[PDB]
């Protein structure tokens, strides 16, 4: 244990007073005694809910909706949803992402047998799913009639040809259900040993209260880390404004029951935001909120004493921000995230970071730099899971990308830009590449989880080191005629 102290620790790094970013310092290695799969990677963002993977979409209007949400949260991530337009629209999107995996399915669609097969067809054409239950009334709290899955409909030329449903369904006497007031363990167990595909739940009065399908099981083992809630729905979050109709923006999604909310800002340290936090917490002590935008400890402290439980840091830091050039605020975000994480560890409040991330290296050392989690926004922009479309300019398949404080929003200034980037493909082939990258970097550092990389920086046992202009212009490729950059 001789172990010379060569390098720089964090507080003796950053107290030089220079605007460090990710591209001008680096991390030392350490000792390794395990393999990369033998890491754990579970992070968190608030005092209650934790995440298997420490990365999150940023709620900007042309980067994230339902697709990003269910897809990335399905990979054990978590998505946030913007607040660009009318609240009922966002209520519909948070509604549709609140399902796509549920516990006991309260209030699914259900019909009365005086419908036709074309009715189930047009229900499917705006649902996509057709394992339909059927009751006497068509209402949810009703008496059971039968069950119809996809195996029942796919072979008929008769879509309405006296296609009242009564002569074609299974008769309910050989249809097992569960009694209500039951947990999942024996529920899923008698599903699989019943082995029939769907499992409704009624009471003694044969009143429909719940139903569960196969799809829990293969979504479970196909996404073994998946960011389940207590009722094993997926998690979700959404962004909000500050103009007084924000209360009407939040209450209807509270009826929709989102799991967390991001207070968006240009800059957080206002009376507006602490007063709306106090508007939240008395109204929703059970619901959680994160804070921003804040880049130093003073704004950090007068946001956290208001009782915010998480934190979005880094203004003037994104791919799209130009608020340095026009508004002269913020700081280099790597210098931010150190000192605001060092302040936020005093109160057990985690922090998620933004902006400027090129690659897995930036976020890798960024969460090693003291951030609990990090909200990358551009390096997952323009996927097939993205809002918008592919299009072409100069012969490249391509998708546009704005900044949600541009002049393109709807006597004003502008501090966001609008542009475009290349396609990056399916996220299910992309974010496992990311988590592989983080776990190779932590494997390089040599910790079996991230929490002791943060402690091991707080112990200062690893060191850090400056880079200069020649070091970064070395840092990528150099002295080479022509190459290709293939991430995976």
């Amino acid at each position: 244990s001789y172990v010379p102290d060569d390098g720089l620790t964090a507080q003796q790094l950053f107290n030089c007073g220079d605007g460090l970013t990710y591209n001008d310092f680096l991390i030392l290695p350490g000792y390794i005694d395990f393999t990369a799969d033998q890491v754990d990677l579970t992070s968190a963002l608030t005092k209650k809910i934790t995440l298997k993977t420490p990365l999150v979409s940023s709620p900007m209007d042309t980067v994230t909706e339902a697709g990003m949400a269910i897809a990335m949260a399905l990979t054990g991530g978590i998505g946030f949803i913007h607040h660009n337009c009318t609240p009922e629209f966002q209520a519909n999107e948070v509604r549709k992402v609140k399902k796509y995996e549920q516990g006991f399915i309260t209030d699914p669609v259900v019909l009365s047998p005086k419908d036709r097969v074309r009715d189930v067809f047009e229900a499917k054409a705006r649902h996509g799913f057709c394992g339909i239950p059927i009751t006497d009334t068509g209402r949810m709290g009703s008496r059971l009639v039968g069950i119809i899955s996809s195996r029942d409909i796919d072979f008929l030329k008769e879509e309405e040809h006296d296609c009242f449903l009564e002569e074609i369904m299974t008769k309910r006497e050989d249809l097992v259900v569960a009694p209500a007031g039951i947990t999942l363990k024996e529920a899923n167990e008698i599903l699989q040993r019943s082995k029939k595909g769907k499992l409704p739940i009624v009471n003694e009065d044969d009143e429909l209260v719940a139903i569960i399908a196969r799809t829990d099981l293969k979504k479970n083992r196909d996404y073994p880390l998946a960011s389940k809630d207590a009722k094993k729905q997926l998690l979700c979050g959404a962004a909000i404004g500050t103009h007084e109709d924000d209360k009407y923006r939040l209450d209807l999604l509270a009826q929709a029951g989102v799991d967390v909310v991001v207070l968006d800002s240009s800059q957080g340290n206002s009376i507006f935001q602490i007063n709306m936090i106090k508007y939240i917490k008395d109204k929703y002590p059970n619901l959680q909120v994160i804070g921003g935008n804040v880049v130093t400890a003073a704004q950090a402290k007068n946001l956290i004493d208001a009782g915010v439980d998480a934190l979005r840091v880094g203004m003037g830091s994104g791919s799209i921000c130009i608020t340095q050039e026009v508004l002269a605020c913020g700081r280099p975000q790597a210098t931010a995230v150190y000192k605001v994480s060092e302040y936020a560890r005093r109160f057990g409040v985690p922090v998620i970071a933004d902006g400027g991330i090129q690659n897995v290296g930036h976020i890798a050392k960024a969460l090693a730099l003291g951030a609990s989690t990090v909200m990358m926004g551009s390096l997952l922009a323009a996927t097939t899971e993205a809002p918008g479309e592919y299009f072409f300019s100069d012969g490249i398949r391509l998708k546009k990308y704005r900044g949600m404080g541009s002049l393109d929003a709807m006597i004003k200034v502008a501090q966001g830009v609008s542009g475009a980037v290349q396609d990056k493909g399916s996220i299910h082939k992309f974010v496992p590449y990311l988590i592989a990258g983080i776990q190779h970097s932590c494997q390089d550092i040599g910790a079996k989880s991230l929490t002791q990389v943060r402690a091991m920086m707080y112990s200062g046992e690893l060191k850090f080191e400056k880079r200069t202009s020649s070091a970064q212009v070395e840092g990528g490729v150099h002295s080479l005629h022509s190459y290709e950059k293939r991430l995976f």
Binding site: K47, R345, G348, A455, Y458
Partner: peptide, 14 residues
């Protein structure tokens, strides 16, 4: 247990 999940144990130590 998120306080453990960030650092754990030391938790400030000025």
């Amino acid at each position: 247990m998120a306080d453990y999940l960030i650092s754990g144990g030391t938790s400030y130590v000025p």
